[model samples]
Target: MNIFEMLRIDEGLRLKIYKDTEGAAAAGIGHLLTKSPSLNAAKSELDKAIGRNTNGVITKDEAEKLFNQDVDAAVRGILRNAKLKPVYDSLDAVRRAALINMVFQMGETGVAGFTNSLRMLQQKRWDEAAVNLAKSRWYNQTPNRAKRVITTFRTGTWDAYKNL
Candidate 1:
């Protein structure tokens, strides 16, 4: 099976439309409906497929295709951002994934705004980066995820996150 198929299984394919935990209209494999012009411009076809209808539906294959495309774009955005590229490239896959996930959660601009954390990351000061990350508003907002990422930064392994 392909990676997208794995993701579809992991995220769970909902044949019927439903509101996600965040209350956003999501259908198929967790495609959150958004009218944002930026998202629309990037995923125009997916947007069109989902449309503005609350009861929109998509086939499992279609959802997997859309989700795969979206993930690819998100990874590309993380890799292509000049400010993030150097730091991103220097890390191992686990760390790289954590950083990419961060950039996905917070836009590139938002993640880039973590000046101290970025500085520590660039300097390869893992503990300092973890401390800096722990002190951020993002840490306060999502302590569990922040802890996992921070622990990964400090320890250079997914052990901490995996344990949680």
Candidate 2:
């Protein structure tokens, strides 16, 4: 499946602004309104994107467009990170999706910190990679998602996420 279908299920879809797990203001598809460079611009767009006045409600169509941009941002961020390039480039499509999902939540920089796991991945040591990833706080914090991602990393297949 494409990243869109995969992410639309794993991530959430909220039409109005809501705080995330860490209380960052987020909206459609877990878009982090609180993390951008300019809070003022973000706030301005937040107001403008809805109706440019009072309404904070987002239409499904508008939400989809925002989702597209966010996903692209995450994907591009991965490609631009030097440390992630080799491992990310070597993965099969399904495993790449898993990486995309991982980066979607933690940001590419967070992924970079998985030094041991990333080395194992680059060497095609699937089991070792999964083992290293399992030991992480990322896995501890989001066990279910991490479980599926680790499974995909080990198998290089989408079997773990097929039901989603």
Candidate 3:
């Protein structure tokens, strides 16, 4: 299904978007400096940031950390607020989450700054989005993670994701 169609504008995802967009950066720093957080702690902070951003509504499901209903709604909100409707219609939920995870990691403005990828996605140019996503700073920064996400985007298969 289309990205927007998959996103239900539910409370959990909405809260997530609001918190992340509003306060995630500071929270990141605080988590890093004050607490030496574990991976789960960091993800929790991220989840809470996204949750609060969306107005205390969005929550992550237990099994999926990155591609749950909350992430879907957060992505939809970002796309709508950014005036990216054209590209928004072309993607499926997995692709949207792959991109949203990058955005959440890089920050919304940083993710939006990916002009080439955005343009390619808007044009329904899947290959180009794959190439662009793979060639980005995000790809270089986290090679393994980037490869996994990009692979899912390209193949449209959850098999690999399930294994991960």
The number of the candidate with the highest lDDT is 2
Give per-residue lDDT, candidate 2, residue 11.
71
| Cα lDDT tens digits for candidate 2, 67-162 | 898889888989999988788899888888888888888899899889889899888999988989999888897788789889988997777768
Rank by TM-score, highest first. Answer: 2, 1, 3
What is the alpha-carbon lDDT for the whole of candidate 3? 0.52
Global Cα lDDT for candidate 2:
0.80
Question: Candidate 3 residues 1-164, lDDT tens each?
Answer: 33322222111132222223223322311111113224444445555645533322343342133344445555665777554445556677677655655554554677677788888777767777889888777788667666766776677665444553
Residue 139 lDDT, candidate 1, scale 0-100: 88
TM-scores vs. true structure, each candidate: 0.68, 0.86, 0.53
TM-score of 3: 0.53
- lDDT score for candidate 1 against the true structure: 0.66
Kindly give the number of clashing pairs for every candidate: 0, 0, 22
RMSD of each: 5.2, 2.9, 9.1
Candidate 2's displacement at residue 127, Å, is 1.0
Better of 1 and 3 by TM-score: 1
- Residue 56 error for model 2, in Å? 2.9
